[PDB]
Design a protein around this nucleic acid. Structure first.
Ligand code: MG
Ligand code: MG
Ligand code: MG
Ligand code: ZN
Lengths: 422, 387
DNA sequence: AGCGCGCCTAATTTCCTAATTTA
DNA sequence: TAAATTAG
RNA sequence: UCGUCGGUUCAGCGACGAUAAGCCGAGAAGUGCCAAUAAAACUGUUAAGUGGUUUGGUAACGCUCGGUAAGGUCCGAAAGGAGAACCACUGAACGGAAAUUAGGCGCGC
């Protein structure tokens, strides 16, 4: 398992912030240059090999023609002369991401199902495991030594050693960094991230650890039902316990955002003079800030929602979690009327349940809210979302979200519906 | 000048849909090959090629990138029409030339072209005719002479397109001669499995001339800062004071927080009213210029229950009056008595969020209802007629 | 007050190298 | 002696 | 009402800023515009027709980069001050980056 944590950079230990910013921006420009050029060299080789096969009947050998086993070696040999400021290790890692992206989707590129990747302006600076190192001083401060320059670059920038920075290691970041220093966690390739808001640089340390999973009974299954009145309702087949996420705070957020977003757009029709004449970024600045705010709110809401769901499973001893596969369903009449980011929520559940030893299975949500959880009679007549579920034969009434949650908690439930469609 | 508008293809007139679909897919495959190969040929022509291209294994006799690419691609994409093939190659080379300096610097990788790429149709290959029975037929020339012989198509391929409302207006002028076809494309959408043919037409725009018969009406309504309406046209424009409500709450917080500071706040609030008036006046005049209305009618000049509370109303009117003169428009002041209550549709004179006539039953925003009443050239006279 | 924009939002996949050798 | 290079 | 500082996100708190949904600078990669010039391609016996290319310049642009207010101690009459140097809370979370795709909108009227 691999996880990432962010650490804010405060000060360069031996340089000024103005000088540090100039170095970082220059290295970012080379990273963009390396990524685009590598895809150009990869795309060029793909065309040459296709042409070579037609004229000779066999694909050419990279070693014979290109001089290297893979295009990654050839890309390094060419981009190095121009991207001479980055460290060779970081440059090689940067090039590899471009070439692997092209190699992975090469078949889709030829078939026209995907475009050639093009890389934007602000790009993270790659760091290799051996290039990053972190130490704790006696006086309780954390110093990170970064290798970000090549020998020509170090000579021209007067730097003669690692460029040290101070990172705020606090809260849950202290435990992760303490385990990295001890040796339980192993640092993998990282990157340096810059955020436009607050103008802060970050150190994106990614680390490798071994999950500690307790033996949980695999016959216990918890069902997650994205309900109508309730954001998510959880139920278990063995025990009559129920949990729910009312999602009251979600409704309040969208009301303020919808009113704000509509108002901003209308003013754009008669905005100020300086609103235009300075590019696209300035003109759409008010909406970009609003769009970023919504993205951050969903990320936090999905983070706390996934944790609550997994924690409920752990308390009840469940070893299996079943949810609805949303690939087929496209009529979102659920509580998340603002088209919530369901995929981010489901991915967060998976990787947090995997860390706890629980296995996640995606059932097909068809007639799951219509079926009765007592007698199993499936009727489409009562599909009205009446906030209640009154079976005409079982005589069992319960919350519609709760009734759907029980059905998802039954093993092989979709097949049961599949065997007897109605 | 040039604008685009889709026209859904109903069915092929001469051949079956199964045959037409197979034919078009063959042409679509040649379109990608022409596009992708033209990018490779332009890459070598501009000197972007690496060493191993011209050293290991593998001037040119032509003058332009398009000329070099055309002949090389023509041998394989022999089903496409010669005229359309040139257009496909041209759009490939034009993008590369526009992006030539970006790729050399390293800001863009390589132009790419998707699978279901639209087919290019030049002028002289797409004609439209309207039959005596009202069916619109568009004849498309898509196959070259070798392709026509093999596929047993002995003339131009004809298809029927839908023309409803705005589509018929443009198409009728195309047939008349006011609008001339420039280029076209056959786009395919997988959402509905339908083929679309969009026509790019060139026309000489007509500049609206100010006439003293369209009179814009402005009402300082309760729900918005102003509402603009007209009788000749059904269009409407609104000035919502969203920024004004935020600024009022800003001023309220600052006064409590500050409890010179009052003087600076008063100076700030004075400038805000001036800046908003300038933006509002310019927008008000622009919508009259856009529709060519030669007169603006606004109620003659308290705070009342209007959305703007204790605003600099007189300053707003003067800047509207002044900016109207520069455009040739003239401003007339009208008595506002019972303007909100009078019904525009029926004229009878009688909840404030949406006005509903007792007799007519017309339901609409009261701000819009008042705005239409002011638009009448002789609204002032009929106001006292009911009295 | 319809039926074409361009494009935004959400969904989706991949990745998070090492071993050797100049300096 | 940490930066450079290339193979699988 | 929005925003800044208190390790990140979302909430409050203490202070503060706001015409900030505001005001500006430089530059020429791209789209329009102005001068000069008229290639590729196609229909063509021809005659000739469609088509709009190339080099400069300008700076209107949802052109491209950037600047601009905001915690407390401290100096400074105050403004202002060289990311000067110290100090700064409560709750719930804490796996991130890049690329791509395809649909439904909010404008469009
Ligand atoms: Mg649902
Ligand atoms: Mg906060
Ligand atoms: Mg905290
Ligand atoms: Zn039942």
């Amino acid at each position: 398992m691999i996880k990432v944590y962010r650490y804010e950079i405060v000060k360069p230990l031996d340089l000024d912030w103005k000088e540090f910013g100039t170095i970082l921006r220059q290295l970012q420009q080379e990273t963009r240059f390396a990524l685009n050029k590598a895809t150009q060299l990869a795309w060029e080789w793909m065309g040459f090999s296709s042409d070579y096969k037609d004229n000779h009947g066999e694909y050419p050998k990279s070693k014979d023609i290109l001089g290297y086993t893979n295009v990654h070696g050839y890309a390094y040999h060419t981009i190095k002369t121009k991207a001479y400021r980055l460290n060779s290790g970081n440059l090689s890692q940067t090039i590899k991401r471009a070439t692997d992206r092209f190699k992975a989707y090469q078949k889709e590129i030829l078939r026209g199902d995907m475009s050639i990747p093009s890389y934007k302006r602000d790009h993270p600076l790659d760091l290799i495991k051996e290039n990053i190192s972190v130490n704790r001083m006696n006086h309780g401060d954390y110093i990170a030594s970064l290798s970000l320059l090549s020998n020509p670059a170090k000579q021209e920038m007067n730097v003669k050693r690692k460029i040290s920075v101070i990172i705020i290691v606090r809260g849950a970041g202290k435990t992760i960094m303490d385990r990295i220093l001890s040796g339980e966690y192993q640092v993998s390739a990282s990157q340096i991230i810059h955020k436009d808001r607050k103008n802060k640089w970050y150190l994106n340390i990614s680390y490798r650890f071994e999950p500690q999973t307790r033996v949980l009974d695999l016959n216990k299954i918890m069902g997650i039902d994205l309900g109508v009145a309730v954001a998510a309702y959880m139920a278990f087949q063995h025990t009559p316990a129920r949990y729910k996420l009312e999602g009251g705070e979600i409704e309040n957020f969208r009301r303020q955002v919808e009113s704000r977003r509509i108002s901003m757009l209308r003013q754009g029709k008669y905005a100020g003079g300086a609103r235009g004449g300075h590019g696209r970024d300035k003109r759409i600045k008010p909406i970009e800030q609003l769009r970023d705010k919504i993205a951050n709110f969903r990320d936090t809401t999905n983070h706390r929602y996934s944790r609550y769901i997994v924690d409920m499973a752990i308390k009840e001893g469940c070893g299996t979690i079943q949810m609805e596969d949303l690939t087929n369903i496209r009529d979102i009449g659920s509580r998340f009327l603002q088209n919530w980011t369901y995929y981010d929520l489901q991915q967060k559940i998976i990787y947090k349940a995997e860390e706890a030893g629980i296995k996640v299975i995606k059932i097909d949500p068809q007639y799951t809210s219509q079926r009765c959880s007592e007698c199993g009679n499936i009727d489409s007549g009562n599909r009205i979302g009446q906030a209640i579920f009154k079976c005409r034969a079982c005589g069992y009434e319960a919350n519609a979200d709760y009734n759907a949650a029980r059905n998802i908690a039954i093993p092989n439930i979709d097949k049961i519906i599949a065997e007897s469609i109605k």
